[PDB]
Amino acid sequence: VNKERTFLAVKPDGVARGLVGEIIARYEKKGFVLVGLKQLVPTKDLAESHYAEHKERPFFGGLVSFITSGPVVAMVFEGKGVVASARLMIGVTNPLASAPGSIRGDFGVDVGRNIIGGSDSVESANREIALWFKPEELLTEVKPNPNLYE
Amino acid sequence: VNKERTFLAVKPDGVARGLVGEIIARYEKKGFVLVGLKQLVPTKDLAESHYAEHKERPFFGGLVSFITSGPVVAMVFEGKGVVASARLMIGVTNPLASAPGSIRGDFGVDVGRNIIGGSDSVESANREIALWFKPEELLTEVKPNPNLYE
Amino acid sequence: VNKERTFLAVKPDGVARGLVGEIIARYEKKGFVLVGLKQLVPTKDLAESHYAEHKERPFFGGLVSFITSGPVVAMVFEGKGVVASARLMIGVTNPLASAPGSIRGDFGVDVGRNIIGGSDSVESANREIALWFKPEELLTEVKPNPNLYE
Amino acid sequence: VNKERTFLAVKPDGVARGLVGEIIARYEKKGFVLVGLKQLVPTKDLAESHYAEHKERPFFGGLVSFITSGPVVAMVFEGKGVVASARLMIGVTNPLASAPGSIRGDFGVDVGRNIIGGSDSVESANREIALWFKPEELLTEVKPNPNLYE
Amino acid sequence: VNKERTFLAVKPDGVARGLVGEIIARYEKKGFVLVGLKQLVPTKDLAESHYAEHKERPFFGGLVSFITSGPVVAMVFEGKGVVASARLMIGVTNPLASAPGSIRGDFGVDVGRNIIGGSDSVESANREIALWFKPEELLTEVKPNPNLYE
Amino acid sequence: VNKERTFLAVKPDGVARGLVGEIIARYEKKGFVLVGLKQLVPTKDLAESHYAEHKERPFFGGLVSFITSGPVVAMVFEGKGVVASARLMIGVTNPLASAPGSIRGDFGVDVGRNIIGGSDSVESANREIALWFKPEELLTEVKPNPNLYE
Numbered sequence: 087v088n089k090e091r092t093f094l095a096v097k098p099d100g101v102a103r104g105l106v107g108e109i110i111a112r113y114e115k116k117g118f119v120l121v122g123l124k125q126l127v128p129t130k131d132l133a134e135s136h137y138a139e140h141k142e143r144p145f146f147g148g149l150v151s152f153i154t155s156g157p158v159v160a161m162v163f164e165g166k167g168v169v170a171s172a173r174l175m176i177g178v179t180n181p182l183a184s185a186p187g188s189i190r191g192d193f194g195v196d197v198g199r200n201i202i203g204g205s206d207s208v209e210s211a212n213r214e215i216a217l218w219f220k221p222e223e224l225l226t227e228v229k230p231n232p233n234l235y236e
Numbered sequence: 237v238n239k240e241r242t243f244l245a246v247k248p249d250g251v252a253r254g255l256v257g258e259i260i261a262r263y264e265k266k267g268f269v270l271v272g273l274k275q276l277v278p279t280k281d282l283a284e285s286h287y288a289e290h291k292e293r294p295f296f297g298g299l300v301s302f303i304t305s306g307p308v309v310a311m312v313f314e315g316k317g318v319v320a321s322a323r324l325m326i327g328v329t330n331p332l333a334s335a336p337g338s339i340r341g342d343f344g345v346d347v348g349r350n351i352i353g354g355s356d357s358v359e360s361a362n363r364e365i366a367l368w369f370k371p372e373e374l375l376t377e378v379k380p381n382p383n384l385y386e
Numbered sequence: 387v388n389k390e391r392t393f394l395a396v397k398p399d400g401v402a403r404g405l406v407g408e409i410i411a412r413y414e415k416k417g418f419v420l421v422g423l424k425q426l427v428p429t430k431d432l433a434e435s436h437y438a439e440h441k442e443r444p445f446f447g448g449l450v451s452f453i454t455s456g457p458v459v460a461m462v463f464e465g466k467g468v469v470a471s472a473r474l475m476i477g478v479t480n481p482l483a484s485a486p487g488s489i490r491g492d493f494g495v496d497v498g499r500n501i502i503g504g505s506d507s508v509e510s511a512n513r514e515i516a517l518w519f520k521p522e523e524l525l526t527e528v529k530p531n532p533n534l535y536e
Numbered sequence: 537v538n539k540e541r542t543f544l545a546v547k548p549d550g551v552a553r554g555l556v557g558e559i560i561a562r563y564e565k566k567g568f569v570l571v572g573l574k575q576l577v578p579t580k581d582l583a584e585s586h587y588a589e590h591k592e593r594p595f596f597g598g599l600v601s602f603i604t605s606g607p608v609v610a611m612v613f614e615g616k617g618v619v620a621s622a623r624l625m626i627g628v629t630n631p632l633a634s635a636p637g638s639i640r641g642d643f644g645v646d647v648g649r650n651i652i653g654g655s656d657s658v659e660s661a662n663r664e665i666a667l668w669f670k671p672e673e674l675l676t677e678v679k680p681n682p683n684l685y686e
Numbered sequence: 687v688n689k690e691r692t693f694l695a696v697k698p699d700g701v702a703r704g705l706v707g708e709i710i711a712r713y714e715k716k717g718f719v720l721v722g723l724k725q726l727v728p729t730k731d732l733a734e735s736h737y738a739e740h741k742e743r744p745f746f747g748g749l750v751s752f753i754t755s756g757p758v759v760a761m762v763f764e765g766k767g768v769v770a771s772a773r774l775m776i777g778v779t780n781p782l783a784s785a786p787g788s789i790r791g792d793f794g795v796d797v798g799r800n801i802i803g804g805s806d807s808v809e810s811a812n813r814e815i816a817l818w819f820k821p822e823e824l825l826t827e828v829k830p831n832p833n834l835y836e
Numbered sequence: 837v838n839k840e841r842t843f844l845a846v847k848p849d850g851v852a853r854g855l856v857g858e859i860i861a862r863y864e865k866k867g868f869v870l871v872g873l874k875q876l877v878p879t880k881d882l883a884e885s886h887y888a889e890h891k892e893r894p895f896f897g898g899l900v901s902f903i904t905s906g907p908v909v910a911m912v913f914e915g916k917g918v919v920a921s922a923r924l925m926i927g928v929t930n931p932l933a934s935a936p937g938s939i940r941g942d943f944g945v946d947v948g949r950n951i952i953g954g955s956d957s958v959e960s961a962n963r964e965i966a967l968w969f970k971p972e973e974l975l976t977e978v979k980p981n982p983n984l985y986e
């Protein structure tokens with residue numbers, strides 16, 4: 087359905103490099119609707135929860151400390167296949183390997199400084215959206231441009 | 237040669253979503269010469285003729301209603317490899333699968349609302365071009381930036 | 387109601403400089419709806435009546451000849467104060483004196499090559515509109531983004 | 537000082553027209569730092585408080601009901617003379633009168649649908665920032681690009 | 687005539703803030719022909735010579751340190767009314783007072799960090815051009831888009 | 837460390853088509869720092885050694901003559917994987933086969949007029965860099981946005 091949501095986050099580097107506007111603008115242009123938005127400096131528990139799957143990985147520590155090293159603008163976009171689409175718009179883990187046209191392909195160079203993060207699955211999305219947003223911070227009844235869906 | 241032409245059309249949704257100029261500019265920048273251009277509200281006939289290959293397809297009815305539910309800015313661009321290039325610049329049938337950087341990859345989400353249509357071959361182009369444009373509506377004197385061709 | 391319409395034309399230089407999509411995009415972004423659009427090579431007769439008010443001025447001859455030199459994409463945008471707004475967005479007759487942000491202020495240098503033309507009054511909008519477009523080439527059913535008007 | 541803040545808000549129309557990204561991007565580009573950000577549907581009391589100065593004005597009722605008619609993304613930018621600068625970037629109350637280059641000059645047409653709102657004074661800014669944001673939702677220790685200030 | 691030249695310089699902050707291409711593109715679009723271009727870290731002399739008119743001014747010392755604290759991409763654009771046009775496109779000394787659409791109006795906040803510098807007169811231009819460029823670093827064969835001049 | 841450098845050149849067609857700022861902006865946006873930059877009219881000798889590897893190929897003659905036809909803005913960008921990344925951002929030798937989002941995929945059509953040139957390896961980067969730039973024309977002190985690298 088056209089009510090599928092995803093969690094996206096302009097990481098501390100993207101925020102610091104002033105990419106928030108550019109990133110939100112790209113998602114709005116593709117037609118996805120913003121249903122949650124806020125700037126915050128992630129807490130250590132939020133970062134370790136958000137990235138729980140890499141808790142065993144070696145970069146985990148440097149990932150968590152970085153994600154909490156500055157303000158992040160967490161957001162949730164809604165729309166048909168948004169989880170997979172948003173990812174496509176993001177690129178690949180390594181911005182060098184990311185194709186021009188994609189967010190990381192256009193703005194990134196380092197894997198640890200890859201501007202933005204997004205859910206990799208609908209299941210990861212629903213969980214992460216609940217980690218970073220309270221139900222009341224999320225739009226309930228949505229209305230995208232009627233020229234977006236059949 | 238560089239006299240090749242393709243037919244392109246900003247669908248009612250692309251027009252309504254304010255993407256007409258966005259689309260024309262992308263072809264102008266690539267170096268294709270706009271040889272014909274007009275805004276029309278397609279008739280059922282033109283649309284059914286245009287999409288005659290999908291006439292037995294389940295989506296035909298909804299498409300023919302869509303394409304004729306409002307304005308369409310039909311255009312013809314000329315240049316070397318234009319038909320295949322234009323398509324590459326458009327993306328894929330499903331906008332969601334279309335890569336960032338391509339028109340549908342940047343602006344679409346629904347297959348029925350895929351912003352733009354273009355010829356899939358020189359044979360298709362020649363028939364669609366003659367389908368939407370009268371000879372007098374297409375330039376004879378075409379000359380692109382001299383820095384475009386060797 | 388705000389169904390006011392203005393006539394605009396990307397002159398041969400603007401068309402040749404590949405700024406058609408750019409100009410159209412600026413008016414689409416503003417909120418104006420395209421109710422007419424076409425590319426033609428203006429006839430000395432249309433050019434002459436178009437600029438009938440300058441028929442006595444010394445630049446007339448070179449002007450009529452310029453506008454008729456090549457393709458022009460004529461268009462009519464409808465909207466609340468579109469005549470005066472479109473002009474503001476154009477700049478001044480002298481591209482150099484046109485402020486940055488305006489079409490001529492961003493893309494022009496010479497007065498004879500000022501990229502775009504537009505009606506200076508509703509009186510002239512209606513006159514020039516009726517000059518370049520047949521009623522059947524213009525939209526009856528005009529519907530802009532509902533977030534544009536109160 | 538370079539720690540001056542202002543309250544800005546992409547109104548329901550700007551949000552609905554997908555201008556959030558574009559607006560935030562303009563402020564980030566001028567060099568102002570984001571110190572507060574969130575999407576919410578203003579409450580009636582928030583709107584009437586925010587616009588308390590027009591409570592006696594005739595448009596007040598339609599202004600309040602509109603501002604609360606949809607989600608708004610309230611934000612606070614910090615920087616040297618940001619209150620006056622942000623306004624300059626906004627334009628004038630009437631988007632038609634707003635110069636090209638400014639937010640309303642580029643995107644608006646109606647006074648009731650003027651895309652964005654911002655503080656008109658440092659004193660109005662500090663109050664409004666407190667109406668829409670809790671101290672904990674605002675960045676305390678700020679760090680803009682060091683190439684921004686002397 | 688259209689052989690006039692002005693000297694422009696993306697200051698260390700503009701360079702560091704990643705605005706070099708942004709600036710060059712704006713002059714290319716306006717129709718000015720880049721006649722010389724290089725990236726250099728200005729010497730105290732070049733800078734003190736360059737800003738000799740402010741040598742007794744309180745801000746001279748801090749300016750001469752700034753302008754020489756990193757790379758500067760000095761350039762010379764040629765074209766009709768270029769010196770006055772370039773300045774118009776730049777804005778005013780104080781970026782905060784510079785209107786949206788102009789370079790400083792869009793990207794600056796501090797007077798000491800005003801992104802770009804340009805000649806204020808043909809006499810100033812001719813001296814600054816000869817100050818930063820050797821004759822062999824400037825084109826002799828200049829030819830702009832033929833759609834630029836009558 | 838990520839001080840890898842590549843040589844890039846907006847060819848005579850790219851320069852003539854006014855795409856210098858656009859190209860530079862795309863690399864500045866990515867995070868690469870310009871450690872060298874100049875506009876010159878390549879000499880047959882430099883052009884010939886530059887393309888020494890194609891000295892036997894049949895297109896050589898017209899190539900050497902083209903690159904030397906007019907101004908070229910040579911540049912060297914430094915950064916993590918800049919050689920391979922810059923290439924990815926360029927597209928493929930054939931502009932038409934170059935994907936949208938890439939420089940050639942967005943602006944080119946002919947193989948002889950492919951807007952931009954760039955090193956295909958660190959070996960060639962270092963060779964071509966030493967070919968077009970004197971050590972004193974290149975930066976020693978390179979400092980990119982600290983949010984770029986870990």
Ligand SMILES: Nc1ncnc2c1ncn2[C@@H]1O[C@H](COP(=O)(O)OP(=O)(O)O)[C@@H](O)[C@H]1O
Nearest residue numbers: 140145149178179197198199200202203204206
């Ligand atoms: N070895 C690495 N070095 C540093 N950080 C890494 C590495 N691999 C993963 N990361 C970071 O952790 C984030 C989470 O990892 P992962 O979920 O695999 O990436 P993503 O979902 O963004 O593609 C990555 O986006 C990247 O910033």
Ligand SMILES: Nc1ncnc2c1ncn2[C@@H]1O[C@H](COP(=O)(O)OP(=O)(O)O)[C@@H](O)[C@H]1O
Nearest residue numbers: 287290295299328329347348349350353354356
């Ligand atoms: N399964 C479908 N459901 C809905 N509309 C579709 C479907 N497949 C194609 N379309 C519509 O019909 C138009 C014509 O179909 P087709 O020629 O297959 O697409 P294209 O050539 O644009 O990739 C489409 O681009 C789209 O608007």
Ligand SMILES: Nc1ncnc2c1ncn2[C@@H]1O[C@H](COP(=O)(O)OP(=O)(O)O)[C@@H](O)[C@H]1O
Nearest residue numbers: 440445449478479497498499500502503504506
């Ligand atoms: N003295 C001039 N020299 C050449 N062309 C001129 C001159 N003044 C006006 N023009 C041209 O004639 C067009 C029509 O005249 P006018 O209505 O005064 O211009 P506009 O309405 O576009 O400002 C101008 O936009 C410009 O191309």
Ligand SMILES: Nc1ncnc2c1ncn2[C@@H]1O[C@H](COP(=O)(O)OP(=O)(O)O)[C@@H](O)[C@H]1O
Nearest residue numbers: 590595599628629647648649650652653654656
């Ligand atoms: N008469 C009007 N009609 C409708 N709404 C109005 C009118 N004048 C003011 N407004 C709205 O109320 C907002 C608040 O008014 P005001 O504070 O004067 O404007 P601003 O501060 O945005 O310039 C205006 O931006 C505009 O949206």
Ligand SMILES: Nc1ncnc2c1ncn2[C@@H]1O[C@H](COP(=O)(O)OP(=O)(O)O)[C@@H](O)[C@H]1O
Nearest residue numbers: 737740745749778779797798799800803804806
């Ligand atoms: N009061 C000031 N304080 C700091 N720097 C200033 C001051 N006024 C001018 N500048 C700096 O010195 C440069 C040269 O001054 P000036 O020629 O007056 O400016 P411009 O011609 O760029 O408007 C400035 O643009 C700016 O970097």
Ligand SMILES: Nc1ncnc2c1ncn2[C@@H]1O[C@H](COP(=O)(O)OP(=O)(O)O)[C@@H](O)[C@H]1O
Nearest residue numbers: 890895899928929947948949950952953954956
């Ligand atoms: N067969 C061809 N015809 C004309 N020019 C060619 C051809 N193949 C390569 N070129 C030109 O020579 C340049 C140098 O050759 P090559 O190194 O293969 O290209 P690149 O590295 O840019 O992909 C090309 O970018 C293109 O302008």
Ligand SMILES: [Mg+2]
Nearest residue numbers: 203204205206
């Ligand atoms: Mg992940």
Ligand SMILES: [Mg+2]
Nearest residue numbers: 353354355356
């Ligand atoms: Mg088809």
Ligand SMILES: [Mg+2]
Nearest residue numbers: 503504505506
């Ligand atoms: Mg007139």
Ligand SMILES: [Mg+2]
Nearest residue numbers: 653654655656
């Ligand atoms: Mg107010």
Ligand SMILES: [Mg+2]
Nearest residue numbers: 803804805806
């Ligand atoms: Mg000065």
Ligand SMILES: [Mg+2]
Nearest residue numbers: 953954955956
């Ligand atoms: Mg090569």
